[PDB]
Write an enzyme that holds these catalytic residues in place. Structure first.
Site, PDB file in Angstrom:
ATOM      1  N   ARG A  11      -6.249 -19.288  53.336  1.00  0.00           N
ATOM      2  CA  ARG A  11      -6.875 -19.783  54.774  1.00  0.00           C
ATOM      3  C   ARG A  11      -5.762 -19.547  55.944  1.00  0.00           C
ATOM      4  O   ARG A  11      -5.725 -20.544  56.775  1.00  0.00           O
ATOM      5  CB  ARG A  11      -7.082 -21.229  54.465  1.00  0.00           C
ATOM      6  CG  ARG A  11      -8.160 -21.737  55.643  1.00  0.00           C
ATOM      7  CD  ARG A  11      -8.144 -23.183  55.521  1.00  0.00           C
ATOM      8  NE  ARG A  11      -9.190 -23.750  56.601  1.00  0.00           N
ATOM      9  CZ  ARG A  11      -9.125 -25.059  57.056  1.00  0.00           C
ATOM     10  NH1 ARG A  11      -8.442 -25.740  56.388  1.00  0.00           N
ATOM     11  NH2 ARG A  11      -9.918 -25.418  57.823  1.00  0.00           N
ATOM     12  N   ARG A  44      -2.515 -25.966  52.036  1.00  0.00           N
ATOM     13  CA  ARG A  44      -3.653 -25.448  50.825  1.00  0.00           C
ATOM     14  C   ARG A  44      -3.832 -24.203  51.107  1.00  0.00           C
ATOM     15  O   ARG A  44      -4.410 -23.572  51.881  1.00  0.00           O
ATOM     16  CB  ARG A  44      -4.900 -26.243  50.808  1.00  0.00           C
ATOM     17  CG  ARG A  44      -4.734 -27.715  51.518  1.00  0.00           C
ATOM     18  CD  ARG A  44      -6.103 -28.027  52.239  1.00  0.00           C
ATOM     19  NE  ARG A  44      -6.014 -29.040  52.985  1.00  0.00           N
ATOM     20  CZ  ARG A  44      -6.791 -29.353  54.047  1.00  0.00           C
ATOM     21  NH1 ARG A  44      -7.744 -28.745  54.473  1.00  0.00           N
ATOM     22  NH2 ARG A  44      -6.646 -30.343  54.759  1.00  0.00           N
ATOM     23  N   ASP A  46      -0.955 -18.200  47.082  1.00  0.00           N
ATOM     24  CA  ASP A  46       0.323 -17.762  46.684  1.00  0.00           C
ATOM     25  C   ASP A  46       0.297 -16.638  45.617  1.00  0.00           C
ATOM     26  O   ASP A  46       0.159 -16.920  44.523  1.00  0.00           O
ATOM     27  CB  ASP A  46       1.390 -18.772  46.520  1.00  0.00           C
ATOM     28  CG  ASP A  46       2.058 -19.236  47.603  1.00  0.00           C
ATOM     29  OD1 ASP A  46       1.791 -19.317  48.567  1.00  0.00           O
ATOM     30  OD2 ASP A  46       3.375 -19.468  47.410  1.00  0.00           O
TER      31      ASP A  46
END
Length: 158
Positions: free
Chosen positions: A82, A92, A95
């Site tokens: 995001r 949030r 990865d």
């Protein structure tokens, strides 16, 4: 070459985010997903009313150069993460970390392999151990050994 990638997701419903990421990974050029570990869970950072992090390890066969693999993991992070509707380091996000690339050691500004300080990260080492128990780092250090000698936080499965 067998590359090992660490997946970390604390966005929306992590389960479907990790599944979207795995599909992207399998679509990477000259690459094939060998195996995927179980999904592991870690507490949020900051407010504890956040989603837990979903952690996983992926064994990926590839003929790409390390930097070429990094290119795609970075692309997926942008496409799936995001970052556009948030921040690059946003709480949030997704990865994708290249922990190991064959038995290669890579020391350059853009990419470090093995991933810097991964030997001190249980949420990376445990999933990696699940899929590659016999794994040995380029410096000869055995994964099984590190898990016996280093103190790690508790790591439950998702």
């Amino acid at each position: 070459t067998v590359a090992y990638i660490a997946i970390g997701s604390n966005l929306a419903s992590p389960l479907e985010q990790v599944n979207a990421a795995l599909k992207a990974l399998g679509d990477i050029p000259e690459s094939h997903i060998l195996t995927v570990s179980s999904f592991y869970r870690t507490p949020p950072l900051g407010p504890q009313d956040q989603p837990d992090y979903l952690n996983a390890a992926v064994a990926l066969e590839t003929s790409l150069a390390p930097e070429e693999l990094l290119n795609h993991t970075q692309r997926i992070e942008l496409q799936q993460g995001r970052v556009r509707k948030a921040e690059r380091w946003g709480p949030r996000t997704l990865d994708l970390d290249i922990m190991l690339f064959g038995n290669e050691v890579i020391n350059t500004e853009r990419l470090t392999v093995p991933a810097y300080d991964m030997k001190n990260r249980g949420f990376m080492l445990w999933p990696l151990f699940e899929i590659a128990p016999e794994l040995v780092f380029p410096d000869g250090e055995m994964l099984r050994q590190i898990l016996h000698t280093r103190a790690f936080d508790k790591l439950n499965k998702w």
